[PDB]
Symmetry: C2
Subunit: 92 residues, 2 copies
Amino acid sequence: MQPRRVELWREPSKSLGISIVGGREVMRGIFIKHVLEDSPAGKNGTLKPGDRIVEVDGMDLRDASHEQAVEAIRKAGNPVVFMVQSIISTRL
Amino acid sequence: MQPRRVELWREPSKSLGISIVGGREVMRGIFIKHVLEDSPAGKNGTLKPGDRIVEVDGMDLRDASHEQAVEAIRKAGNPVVFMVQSIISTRL
């Protein structure tokens, strides 16, 4: 599907509620591993496992390292603005 | 972590309870996207989102296409035997 914008509003003393994997190579891109249901990301509802993170707070992450992505997200203000894109998957 | 063996026992009229992403390139490797809690994969308990699928029922999937992996899993007997390896992730 098409790339889309996600604005995560931080909550004090809570993590955003995502885990990320990947980065600059079995998984070059940066992707969402998990989303905690009872969390900012869960409450948002539009960020999903398997979503590729293409930008965070204006910074291009399309050829980024795991560290650059982690850093971009941690140093983002509020809201944390992602551009994400879903990847094709198969249910078995 | 180390590669490990997972034996999924199929249940009649139920899907295995996994979704997979990736394949032969933002995600070259084959990885578990989702595991349904109330399913064979969920009941097993040892297969997790973010796990790289390296073999299925004896077939090497280390340079496999999405289609080859889907096919390997669908054509597997019972139990469906995976070799998987976790990838590093970061919680935010």
